[PDB]
Amino acid sequence: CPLMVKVLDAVRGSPAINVAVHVFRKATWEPFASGKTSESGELHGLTTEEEFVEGIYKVEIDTKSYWKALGISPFHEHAEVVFTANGPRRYTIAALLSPYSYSTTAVVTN
Amino acid sequence: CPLMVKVLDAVRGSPAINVAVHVFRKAADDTWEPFASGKTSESGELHGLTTEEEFVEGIYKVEIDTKSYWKALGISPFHEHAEVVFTANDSGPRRYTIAALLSPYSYSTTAVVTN
Ligand SMILES: N#Cc1c[nH]c2ccccc12
Ligand SMILES: N#Cc1c[nH]c2ccccc12
Ligand SMILES: [Ca+2]
Ligand SMILES: [Ca+2]
């Protein structure tokens, strides 16, 4: 699956590999799911259809550790994507990373 | 003008007017303390958030209220807000502009930092 995250690197022109991603649900922010992106920049298996209910969620991507592992100077502490989950749907949260910028979009399909 | 925020609307090709922006600063006990807030002008700009004296080193969070912006235009958006979190002033004072470009299911942000 219901929730997937995909992260891309705009400097190197590649998937962003081995990035830590934490997901929280709003209760204060309670930990819900986490993982590290794969060689393709994707993180699957975060949750299940049963666990992923409507509500407010935050996806926190540890962009600062990523850029430090590449020896590139970053601006942000992390990137955070906060959204409301409201028929049948799959959510992809995608992010494109640069040292002083990031962009995010949601892909929501049936 | 050590901290400025600029917001644009990618659907209408316009400044994003009357957008609420809240700034927080991380406290010693690791919670977020209110720091400053304001609303964007007719030009999409928000100046006058803070001063050189109040804008000390720290970890700051700028929360731009994109959900209320879209709902006022009659649109149901995906995100609650757009957030930017960064360490400021670590090597002395700098001037920061935080810019954001909005669509209903997407946003992008960039920082422009000058000495
Ligand atoms: N994945 C992803 C993206 C997030 N923002 C973009 C901008 C251009 C192309 C791809 C994406
Ligand atoms: N303002 C602003 C922006 C935030 N992200 C951008 C991407 C392209 C052009 C402008 C902006
Ligand atoms: Ca879990
Ligand atoms: Ca310092």
Oligomer: homodimer
Number of helices of chain A: 1
Distance between the termini of chain A: 12 Å
> Helix fraction of chain A?
under 10%
Q: Write down how many β-strands of chain A occur, each being a DSSP E stretch of 2 or more residues.
A: 9
- Report the major sheet of chain A: 5 strands, mixed
Question: CATH-wise, what's the superfamily of chain A?
Answer: Transthyretin/hydroxyisourate hydrolase domain
The CATH architecture category of chain A equals: Sandwich
Biggest interface pair, residues each? A-B, 19 and 19 residues
**Radius of gyration of chain A over alpha carbons?**
14 Å
What's the CATH topology label of chain A?
A: Immunoglobulin-like
What is the CATH class designation of chain A? Mainly Beta
Number of folding domains of chain A?
1
Quote the beta fraction of chain A: over 45%
Which ions, cofactors or small ligands are bound in this entry? 1~{H}-indole-3-carbonitrile, calcium ion
Structural class, from secondary structure content of chain A?
mainly beta
Overall geometry of chain A: globular
- SSE order of chain A: EEEEEEHEEE
Function (chain A): Thyroid hormone-binding protein. Probably transports thyroxine from the bloodstream to the brain.
Subcellular location (chain A): Secreted; Cytoplasm
Family (chain A): Belongs to the transthyretin family.
GO molecular function, one term (chain A): protein-containing complex binding
Secondary structure layout:
The structure is a homodimer.
Chain A: E1 3-9, E2 14-15, E3 20-26, E4 29-36, E5 42-43, E6 55-61, H1 63-69, E7 76-85, E8 90-98, E9 101-109
Parallel strand pairs in A: 1-8
Antiparallel strand pairs in A: 1-2, 1-5, 3-4, 3-6, 6-7, 8-9
Bound molecules: 1~{H}-indole-3-carbonitrile (2 copies) and calcium ion (2 copies).
One 1~{H}-indole-3-carbonitrile binds at residues 6, 8, 94-96, 103-105 of chain A.
PDB class: transport protein
Keywords: Amyloidosis, Retinol, Thyroxine, RBP, transport protein
Assembly: dimeric
